[PDB]
Each structure stands twice: as structure tokens, then as C-alpha cells.
Amino acid sequence: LIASIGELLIDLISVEEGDLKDVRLFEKHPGGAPANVAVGVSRLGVKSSLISKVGNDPFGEYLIEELSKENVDTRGIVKDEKKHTGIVFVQLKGASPSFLLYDDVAYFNMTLNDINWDIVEEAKIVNFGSVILARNPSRETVMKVIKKIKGSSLIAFDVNLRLDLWRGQEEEMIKVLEESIKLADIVKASEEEVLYLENQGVEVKGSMLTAITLGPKGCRLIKNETVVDVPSGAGDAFMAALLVGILKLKGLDLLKLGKFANLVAALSTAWSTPRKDELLKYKEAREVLAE
Amino acid sequence: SLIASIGELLIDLISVEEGDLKDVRLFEKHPGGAPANVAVGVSRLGVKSSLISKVGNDPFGEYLIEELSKENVDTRGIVKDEKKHTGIVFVQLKGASPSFLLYDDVAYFNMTLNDINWDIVEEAKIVNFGSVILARNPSRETVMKVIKKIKGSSLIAFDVNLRLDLWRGQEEEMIKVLEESIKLADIVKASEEEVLYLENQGVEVKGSMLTAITLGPKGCRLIKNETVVDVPSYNVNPLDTTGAGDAFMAALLVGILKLKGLDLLKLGKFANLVAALSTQKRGAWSTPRKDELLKYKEAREVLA
Predict the structure, then answer these.
(1) Is the Nuclease keyword given for this protein (chain B)?
(2) Residue B189 annotated as binding?
(3) With contacts defined as CB-CB under 8 Å, which chain B residues touch A84?
(4) C-alpha dihedral, B43 to B49 to B55 to B59, nearest 10°
(5) How far is the alpha carbon of B62 from chain A, nearest alpha carbon, in Å?
(6) Is the dihedral of CA A55, A59, A64, A65 positive or negative?
(7) Binary contact (B26, A23; C-beta < 8 A)
């Protein structure tokens, strides 16, 4: 079982191109990296859990319904009576994609009282990302959960850096990213993030494995000093693939992992992860999923 | 001659299809918030209109200010909040049970006394507010102070615009603030359902100068002291009645501003015509323009 903990939210995706100021039409989709990964993990045929918080509102109900349809365990999703479901307005189109994320929302309001401990304890891998850490009490709550399960579950961290979420608190940002990276067995980061954080004296590496995304150029898997370069919603598909691969591959065969993750990422091209039997025709997937 | 509106200014994300908000896939972005809608109506009727509100320092805040500006609504009294995002509400207008999901920790609910352009409020001959703004502090206390400050110097108009969902857990505070607001108002607008609800809790729903009671599609009623003027609706074929209430408010306020006295018949016929004509226009800003209204004698009384 893989648990994901963090943001679960409505993506209001701009139908047309343009600055958010000018966008007239939005399409509602479930979103939030950990949710996307959790769905991806489930579509790859692994039992997946999501720990998050939604509002007691139609949007919270929607997100829970959408996750349930994907066979993601939703028992760890709590309803906030005081905060509304996370929303972000997304412009994915253009040279400069943008977002307007509403921060005073349910997923940023997680306390330790909100944590389903059965789920965290059942998890072989716990996945979290930096977005959830942007605000307290969820930052504190998540960090305490990760610290706790450290050594009992593999910890996966997607740097998923959104500087906008850290304005006026960039000192704290670096501290929490560093602490989170240090806690992580598996780190996913873009090379932009790697550069940015290392230029800040933060080494971007998992204790077990590091996945560096390279955009068009594909990605890189690093395990100690073994480096596998694999030329090429997809990022979260890729993460789901990595975590599923890590869980499935007895001795962490990096070549197989790489090939599997690339395939899932390729076929994905926010819930874009291919289903298990979309991958049965591929030797690369059977290598991971069936053996 | 200025009419100032104060309160919520937000993005309406309007369901483009029928269904529960849970299930609605597509939302059209429009400017909303009753006082903004009234402010636009006032401007459309040819009267200087200012809106005091607060948006986020974000694209949605910029959008709202720009849309207001396009309508010639003075936007100088709109403050940008560096800590809260622009108001948003997801709205299902269609079906038997229209619904909304209003996000409350947003900029328009974060007004403090420092955010108030006192020059604008002191200039206003009429100041318009509604109950939605009162649902949260600091804006509630701030707005109540603005209204108390100008009581006696400008006419105060209050759209009861009651949204019970905005007051859960604070129903006693709501009744208190609604009563205090009504008691401060010269002009009160309320639906017959609001009148019943509030008056049955010992809150008289009456402005000191004038009360406009809306009866939905059936029309409305204007009350001054003991005088009741019933204004049945015109037998319109409506395109969209979403903006009719705010169009009606705008007409009432412009009418009161323009007429010699509180002539209920002239005011009723004008507000009726504006509302009727608003039904032919889509969306929350449906008030017809002065130039269109001038083609009718009921409007020429007030506007010309």
C-alpha cells in the first residue's frame, strides 16, 4: 500500500488561453499532486490511500467521489467544517502557465486529529510534496507524520516547488524543504529545482533514490552513484510509476524502474496515469507489474 | 451627486450547465457581488457610482476592477488585499433549488477602517450596503462603522439579501446585525420571504424613509409610513432575471436621488421599468442603459 498525504483540491482549468484575469471559462477537475499520484498508483493496480482535508461542501463531495471511482481509499480524507475545499485556478496554456491558488482552504488546515493512523501505519510508501507544507497547521502536521513513519515506511517527496506559495516566508521554505528532503528515501525534483535548491545550499537527493525530471529530455534516476538517464499530469503519473515500481521491483532494478516510469509517463501524455491493462502489452510494464 | 456602494465584490463562477455544483463541469467567470451589481446599475442609469470593497492583489482582483472601470464605476475605493485572495463564489443559478458555494476567507471580508476611502463615503448622497458583507469580520464591524459614521449625512440603503448559509453558527449575531443595519437604513429592500423571516424574530423590516418589498416575478411594493404602493410586474418575456433585483435596487436609488420628493408612483413605475428591461439582458449586471430607458416615458420622469 502507498499512501499520499497533502493537497486535494479542485483544479479550475482555463478552457481558453490568456491571463487568468481574462479567462472566461473554467473546467472543474480533481487535482493536487498527492491525489494525482494516489489515483495513478491505483490505476497501476496498487492499493492507494490519500490523507487530506476537504470542505464539507459540494466540491469536497466531488473530490471524494472522483477518488472513490478510481478505487483510492478515501477514509483518510477528513471534512473541514470551517474551511472550504481547496481550489486553484489554472492556466496551463501559453509560454508562461500560471495559477491562482486559494490558500485559506481545508487541505492547509490539517491537524494531528485529522490523521487516519491506520492508513499511515499500513503504508509501505508514504508520498508527500512541498505544496502541503506551504501553510500551517498542515505543514506541522505533515512533518510530524513523516518524521514518525520514518524508518517504518519508505518516504517519497516531490519537491514540486511553487515559489508563489512561499512569499514572505522563503527562509522557512528552505528550512522545510531541506528537512523534508532529509526525511525522504525517494526524492523527485526537476533539474530547475535541483539547481535552485543546491544554489541555496540544499542537496536534493533521496537517501535511497533520486528522480530528476528533465522536461523534454526525459529524466534521470540516481541511486547512490548509479545514474540512469532515460530520454522521453505526466509528472504525477511518473511518480506513481516510480513508487509502484519501487514497491514491485524486489531489488530496485533501476533499468526496469526507468523503463517502466518512462512508459507510464509517455502513455500519460491531472489524472493522466494509464490503467494497468493499458500497459499489459508492454514488456517494460509486465517486468514491473506482473514479475 | 454620487451613490456609493459598499460591500462584497467577487468573482461569480457561474455553472454553464444544470446540476448540483458537485457535478457541474464548467463555470463562466463574471463580476459579481450585489453592491458591485448595484454600483454598475447606478452608473448605467447615468449617475456617478463608487464602490468601496476589497479584492486580492491577484488577476481576479484586477479583472473586477477593470470590469467596473469599463462600466464607469469609480474603483478608487477598491483596496487590494496582499493577504487574502479575491472573493469567489461558485453559483448554480438553474433548477428549482439554486445553490452557491461562497468562499469566505477572502479579501472583501477583510476590510478594516484603514481600507475605507472616507472622501468617497462623505461625498455620497446615498450609501448602499447589503447583508452579505456583514457575514464576517473584520468587514462586518468596519461596514457597520462606515454606516454609523455617515448616518445623518447621506441616505443609507440596505438590501437585506439574506443568505442563511453565510450565518450558520451565528444566527443570533445575524439577527442583531440585520436589525442594526435595518435601523440605520433610510431605504430597505427585502423580499417578502425575508420580511416574514425577520419580522417573526421581532426585527421590523422597514427603512426609516422607504421600504421596497420584492414579490419575485409578481412585482414589488413600496412602503412609506402607512402608504403601500403595489407595483405588479410587466408581463415580460424574460431572457434572464438574475440581475433584476440589483437592477431594481439601482433604479430605486437613482430614482430617490433624482426625484424631488419620495414620489412612490414615479419611483415605482421607474423601478418597475428598469427591472422589466433588465430581464432582456444576461447576467448579474443586467440594468439597462439610460439611453435605452429614455425611449420610455416612465424613465424620462426620473432621468430626463
Answers:
(1) no
(2) yes
(3) 101, 103-104
(4) 40
(5) 7
(6) positive
(7) no
Give the angle subtended at the CA of B30 by the CAs of A54 and B55, to the nearest 5°: 70
Chain A residue with minimum CA distance to B26? A27
**CB within 8 A of A211, min separation 6: which ones?**
A186, A187, A188, A189, A219, A220, A221, A222, A238, A239, A242, A261
Sign, CA dihedral B276-B281-B283-B286, equals negative
Rounded CA-CA distance B175/B181 in Å is 10
B25 touches chain A (CB under 8 A): yes
* Amino acid letter, residue A213: T
Q: In units of Å, what resolution does this entry have?
A: 1.9
Backbone angle region of A260, left / alpha / beta, with phi > 0 → left and psi within -120 to 50 → alpha: alpha
B23 contacts on A by Cβ (under 8 Å): 62
The 3 state secondary structure assigned to A130-142 is CHHHHCCCHHHHH
The experimental technique used to determine this model is X-ray
Domains along the sequence of chain B with CATH: 1-304 (3.40.1190.20)
DSSP class per residue in A10-28: EEEEESS-S-TTT--EEEE
Cell representation of residue B264: 412612490
For A97, phi then psi, to 5°, come to -60, 145
Burial class of A94 by CB neighbour count within 10 A (0 to 12, 13 to 18, 19+): exposed
Cα A6-A11-A16 angle, rounded to 5 deg: 155
d(Cα A23, Cα B203) in Å, to the nearest integer? 43
Asked if the Cβ–Cβ distance from A58 to B27 is below 8 Å, we say no
Kindly list the residues from chain A whose CB atom is less than 8 angstroms away from the CB atom of residue B14. Answer: none
* A residues 90-119 lying closer than 8 A (beta carbon) to B: 98, 100, 102-104
Residue of A23, A261, A3 lying closest to A128 (CA atoms): A3
Q: Which three cell numbers stand for residue A244?
A: 509502484
Nearest beta carbon to residue B26 from set A19, A20, A27: A27
